[PDB]
Design a protein around this ligand. Structure first.
Ligand SMILES: Nc1ncnc2c1ncn2[C@@H]1O[C@H](COP(=O)(O)OP(=O)(O)OC[C@H]2O[C@H](O)[C@H](O)[C@@H]2O)[C@@H](O)[C@H]1O
Ligand SMILES: Nc1ncnc2c1ncn2[C@@H]1O[C@H](COP(=O)(O)OP(=O)(O)OC[C@H]2O[C@H](O)[C@H](O)[C@@H]2O)[C@@H](O)[C@H]1O
Ligand SMILES: [Mg+2]
Ligand SMILES: [Mg+2]
Ligand SMILES: [Mg+2]
Ligand SMILES: [Mg+2]
Lengths: 202, 205
């Protein structure tokens, strides 16, 4: 019984309340939960940043062993980063009735001008589950990186396409030049799986 | 290759307006920024979740090829996860006048009952920079897994946090399978899968 965790039957959600509602929401969860030493906690409250969930596309060209990155400003990066312009994966929020794949394919075209061939799921992760419910689901998508260039984006969206070798992109993760979770996770996954992925797609 | 195009001088933060202030806060950033084809944008606003920044420690026993994980409830995971109790890295929020390593070492003791030997940086990442400023900085720490006092379940912190000790291969398999699916642990364990061979050699010489 390694890694067996407590379950949803060990927590009682008492109420969910909305503290702020705008573009996103801030909710308050009130709950009680089982303690590892036995028995139950008192009522606990936690603030939860509720912004829905997102799809992420790692655009990989298996013939060229290249990745397509998109550069855009993320103002929230400002206070802790050298620059708020980040090198990132194609990504977008998911709405009702849409799939991860729908969003990934649409954003690849809107954000990078890319048609996508085959896709494969990589990983789905919680961005920061002590304070936000956000989950992101990553796919790898087959692209022609020789086509990828220019300035894209809609609505105050200004995006520059960069094409780099896989090895260079991964080194940029190691060095801290790429340092947003979605790109780090996707490019680490690629560094662990590129051999078989290139074989599969050629 | 060339890299990013613009710097902090290319953005003007006009204001940061409080939308919510409680334990954490939500700010409306109002700003204008330079455009790739020249000139500046008009005014843009973004809602940004402000919760400070964190230190994360991957506790790795290089002699045994084992990892120490901690389990605790993360209620925000509930709506999209099998359980809100997650298997995670040791982690804590950073306060003014503390380094990442100060926090990582303190939390290793408070959360897992562990002293740490050598450390190395893994990487420092932005959790979700379209909507939150949060940065988390990960170190790998040399531990003797047998000495995790948190294994006994006895401290009061152990009512809230439970210690698991697993093989590296099992921890990584759990990433592949989706059992471990919080960003900090995914990032740390993928890094470990890419670096364990050299790291074990370094730390067992
Ligand atoms: N914080 C915000 N406040 C207000 N409006 C916003 C905000 N963020 C986006 N919009 C609006 O929504 C549009 C952008 O929508 P899409 O492309 O689907 O989302 P994404 O790529 O931003 O976020 C996807 C993930 O990647 C990131 O890391 C995030 O943290 C997520 O985890 C913008 O044009 C704005 O008009
Ligand atoms: N949502 C919340 N609302 C209110 N109080 C909270 C909340 N979360 C924590 N506290 C309070 O803060 C204390 C916990 O503080 P520390 O141990 O330094 O932070 P951590 O391990 O939680 O967060 C570290 C990272 O790991 C996670 O992934 C997070 O997303 C972070 O990214 C709790 O005892 C509460 O009193
Ligand atoms: Mg986007
Ligand atoms: Mg978009
Ligand atoms: Mg903690
Ligand atoms: Mg703590």
């Amino acid at each position: 019984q390694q890694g067996i965790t407590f379950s949803k039957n060990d927590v009682e959600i008492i109420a969910r309340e909305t503290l702020y509602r705008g573009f996103f929401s801030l909710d308050l969860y009130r709950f009680r939960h089982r303690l590892f030493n036995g028995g139950m906690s008192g009522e606990i409250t936690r603030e939860i940043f509720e912004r829905g969930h997102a799809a992420v596309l790692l655009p990989f060209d298996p013939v060229r062993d290249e990745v397509v990155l998109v550069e855009q400003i993320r103002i929230a990066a400002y206070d802790t980063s050298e620059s708020p312009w980040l090198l990132e994966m194609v990504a977008g929020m998911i709405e009702a009735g849409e799939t991860v794949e729908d969003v990934a394919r649409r954003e690849a075209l809107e954000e990078a001008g890319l048609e996508v061939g085959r896709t494969k799921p990589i990983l789905s992760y919680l961005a920061s589950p002590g304070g936000t419910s956000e989950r992101l689901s990553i796919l790898v998508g087959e692209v022609d990186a020789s086509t990828a260039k220019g300035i894209h984006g809609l609505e105050n969206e200004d995006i520059r396409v960069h094409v780099v070798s896989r090895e260079q992109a991964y080194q940029w993760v190691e060095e801290g030049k790429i340092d947003n979770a979605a790109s780090v996770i996707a490019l680490q996954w690629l560094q662990l799986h590129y051999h078989n992925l290139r074989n599969e797609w050629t």
